[PDB]
Amino acid sequence: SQFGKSFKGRTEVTITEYRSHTVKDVHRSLLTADKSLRKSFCFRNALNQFLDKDLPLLPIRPKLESRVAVKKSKLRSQLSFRPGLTQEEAIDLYNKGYDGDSVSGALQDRVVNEPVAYSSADNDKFHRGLAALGYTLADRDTCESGFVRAIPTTPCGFICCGPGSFKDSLGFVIKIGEFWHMYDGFQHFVAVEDAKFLASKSPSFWLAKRLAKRLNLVPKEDPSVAAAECPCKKVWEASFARAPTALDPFGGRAFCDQGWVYHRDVGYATANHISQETLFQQALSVRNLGPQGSANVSGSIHTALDRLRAAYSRGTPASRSILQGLANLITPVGENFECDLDKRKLNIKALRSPERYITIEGLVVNLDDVVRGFYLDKAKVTVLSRSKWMGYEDLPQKPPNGTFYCRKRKAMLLISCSPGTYAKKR
Amino acid sequence: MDSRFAQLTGVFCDDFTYSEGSRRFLSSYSTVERRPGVPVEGDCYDCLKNKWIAFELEGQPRKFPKATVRCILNNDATYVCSEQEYQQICKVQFKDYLEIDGVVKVGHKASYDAELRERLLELPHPKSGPKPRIEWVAPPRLADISKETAELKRQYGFFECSKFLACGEECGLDQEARELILNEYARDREFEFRNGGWIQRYTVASHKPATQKILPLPASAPLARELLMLIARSTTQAGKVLHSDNTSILAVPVMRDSGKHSKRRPTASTHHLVVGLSKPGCEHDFEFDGYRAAVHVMHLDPKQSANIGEQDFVSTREIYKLDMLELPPISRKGDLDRASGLETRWDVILLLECLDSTRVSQAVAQHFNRHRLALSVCKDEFRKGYQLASEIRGTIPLSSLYYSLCAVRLRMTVHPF
Amino acid sequence: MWAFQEGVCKGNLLSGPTSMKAPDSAARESIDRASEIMTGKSYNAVHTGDLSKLPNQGESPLRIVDSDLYSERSCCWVIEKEGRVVCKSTTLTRGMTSLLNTTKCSSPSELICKVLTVESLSEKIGDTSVEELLSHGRYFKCALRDQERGKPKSRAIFLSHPFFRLLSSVVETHARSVLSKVSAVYTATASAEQRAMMAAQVVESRKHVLNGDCTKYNEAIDADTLLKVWDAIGMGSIGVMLAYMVRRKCVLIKDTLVECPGGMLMGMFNATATLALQGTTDRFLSFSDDFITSFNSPAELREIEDLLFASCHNLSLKKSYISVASLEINSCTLTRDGDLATGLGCTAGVPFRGPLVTLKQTAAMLSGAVDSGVMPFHSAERLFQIKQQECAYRYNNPTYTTRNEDFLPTCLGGKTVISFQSLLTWDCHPFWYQVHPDGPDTIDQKVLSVLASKTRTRLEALSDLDPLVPHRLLVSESDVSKIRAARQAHLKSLGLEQPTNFNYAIYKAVQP
RNA sequence: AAAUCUUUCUCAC
RNA sequence: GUGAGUAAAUUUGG
Ligand SMILES: [Zn+2]
Ligand SMILES: [Zn+2]
Ligand SMILES: [Zn+2]
Fold this sequence. Notes:
heterotrimer, A: 3-stranded antiparallel β-sheet, 27% helix, B: alpha+beta, 3 domains, 5-stranded mixed β-sheet, 16 strands, RNA-binding, viral protein, Viral polymerase, pentameric
């Protein structure tokens, strides 16, 4: 009759409240950790039990061995994305008798930010505590390695490693009319979003899983899904230019308007897709490819799009293209967003502010400076002092971002928005 | 899926059965009727026809799959549905008008809003206050820190001996001699002996703080790790002499003397009097059987003892040493003395920071970090950041603050920035 | 030693201060300061900035996050037995359950809808009314928080009524949303390092940086300012009720109720207080009592000071300063070019709390240090070896271990002093996996958790639930019993006992 | 007695 | 307010 006591006067309560009432109480022991561990030799007995029973059953983890050369750089927020269980996997695990709470806990995708000041040539991600030594998350086929690289070392005559057509190991997902066509080379499937599901004939199809993850929809089985036209064969046999860009967080590279190429083995991006040196190249690549949902923006996406539109109203064609690329970068795919900065209503409020700032993946960009041609044409200089500072190098002819000493003006300069850092035509 | 329709759905599934016993309509809002492992696609599920049913109001589409059958609840009392059987079931079941409560917005204005606004108006409001006048000047110079240290010294002065800090060095007695001296000192203090342990009994308190003075620095602290470990062990092992390799202490519970019926064993909140030995030569000297040693006491509460005993002296020293400038020799009173100063005294200072449970040195360090990074500061206010004496009370925290300020002054003197 | 560091050093190596003092003195001091500010003699608590440009969220549906309303943290429950008001300290879960029991309501959302719907303050919502709810929601209890480095006098915190927390959750969620929509650079959810990096990028175009802090932040944010912001963003009657309760707040100290009409009590409305400033200008990258604005000329500095004054963000003349070579926010210091300032920085030591947990915490701290530029890797290796030696000195007695196998740590009787690099790159005996920062929990943690757990009448368990079932659904005793019976029957049909534990890491390891 | 409203254990009427 | 006893921190850290 504990229900009538804990919840006296009510017959029904939410599952949240009931579960919160069934949490085992924990008392804060006043003793130190050492004394608690000594009490009744609890730690001694636990160590004996572990060495006698649990230790032999522990699986042996593989040893990390892949390393790359690194150098010190600015402090950056490395993002590690550990994906959660899919809905089908969780359902199957629950039906197999596994704990419901544990399965629920693993159902949520997780992103963790850690500060690191170390960068490799290919903007690789590093294992925890091994950024300095260069241990990378990625593990060393030549085509598989070249697919994930912005500039493949050796072109192979196919889309994965350069301009060309589609190979057997590559698939693509494209949008035609109001349907998503997934073509691998052997199978062709069509999907549509009903309300919150991606309904498809074969949701277990790997391209279907990738599409569901990109669109943020629950895969669903629907035999009654068909499309009228399907140029997937011609697209497969045609050749497309390969933009020089690291794979997006979803593990694919765009090749046409609302079309993405995926490699079967390359699951998820193991390198930073967006970086200070590659932000504008990525923006230019997807100029007219529609929303990509590849870059996270700090704050509201609607506010970011409003600022982008406000900056779009005034600017040269190059600035307009850059702004459209950024808008496509930050806009999720398939959601109710007007990322096109030609039909989006201009917000009068956005023009009121003097500066238009947007934070993309930790990079703060002033769109007004972009319109004036700063990150691509000329750098910005601010004098910090008229006295030389110890430990600071002289000003180069084409300085990158950073603090330098100029002997021509005999002053400490801070260079920001430098084309030598953002454009880097090399 | 909206809870606003939950109850309505429950009315739709009203004792409807199929297959001779099996419930026909399963409500998505019911935790028992839900089918485990089956994603929901409508308000309820019909097992007979295997179809999802969703209820909607006129001109209010709901985000459900197109295959879900929609029962439109017309503005006038009327129910339209493509499937005839569902329409009839809606007609019969919804005999009593079931009006779905509207969606409440966060900006909803209650009927009592005006009354509460009037009540707020009648209540007190703040006055504007003065706009401060801020003058930005250079950070404090060495003279200001010297003045602060001199003011502290003038206000409080110094003790004749280092008291418990002296326990960081060997007392020059063997284990048996140390145990004998500690036990005989406890006996001479009239400490109660019970169950083989010592207890300190108290009846009344002056309700005033103890005298505060700065502790002169011993030469070194070779036994810092041993002393901290002994303090950690004494958290529960109190009343008997605890021995280490080179020294020993005695933690005596401090308990009230109620009378015939008085506390006999310590509880969670009982305080400890930690008694330690050091070399003689001060007013705290104690002699027994030709063995001489200075006996110094320290009164702690359980939290202080745990915090002190959990510190790692060696690791902290190494971490500081990683990127440390040369440490100059200093005198007994933390003054630069190249001729006769000792660098090992710095270790002693570290030990003091471990003993100080208020960690005022942390506040001094934060303010000094601000000082070293600053180009300009507010006049007469930034200097009023090292005056932390009012924030602490006790010989140990006061000495810790004084020697932190001395460290700041020494840094400004020998390694100007 | 911290004074002679070549680089920046906050002196965080030792643990924070401890105190067993009662919280009466600190709460009394805070209330006295708030009363002094109300008189308008020391600081400014009158907001005069323009918030008319903030977007109105009044049309958003009223949604409440139930999870945030239940927890094991303390809260104040008020009872009126014989005309006397008794405030008791209970758990937030128990307080919310008692609130829902007194006002018959399935969920907090139903309760808030009922409160907003009544036509009179005296209309009953069960065994109470909106008038009684407002009267009881203004009572707070005082407590002490310690272990804050650099604060020898431990601070005073306050436990609020469940109804006050319920309204605060809504207003704070909407204030955070408005901040994300309006802030020049959103930082409400960012960490210290992320905020510092964003600030370094933002202040890159101005010569001078004002590393500023606010003093008496909690005591200067008046109920009038909170109501102003809430009306600007359109909180309707919820904001009015919350401001009314704040203005009439009373704190129970020892056995006496003390009125505190001035300011708020703690950082309850951090988002609203931040919006009080962010809604007047876009010149500050700030959250709560910390901003990193920049300027070029003294006139701009005076403008910044005026903007801070008008928004009740009184500058702390003791701690605020001006720098040109560095910028510091949230204790994180960076150079103007974005590099982390050389030195120990905010590195904190690891106290002795177990033979293995101490080693794991040291490994995590050193991994964080080496991932940044704090120290080179060989220094971390040496420090890890030193920590292993210290743990051997501390925990190598029979009361902790009786083993002698070589692969064990020297602190558990073994002969292995593992290398930091070898441990990090999974190049060790499996016994060392628990010591890895990303490894499984150590034996010490499990033993301590078991000890904590092991200490009347339990409700029937509602575990092993279908992962797809929303937690907002209602269940009674019969429903709980039926769900348990059905799940047990399904498990038995599988020839299974209580459900097998699921480990995501182990399952993923078996996946390939 | 001291880092001084803290050093405040239990049971029964 | 009176009386009575002495489950919890000592078992077990050099
Ligand atoms: Zn290829
Ligand atoms: Zn096709
Ligand atoms: Zn003495």
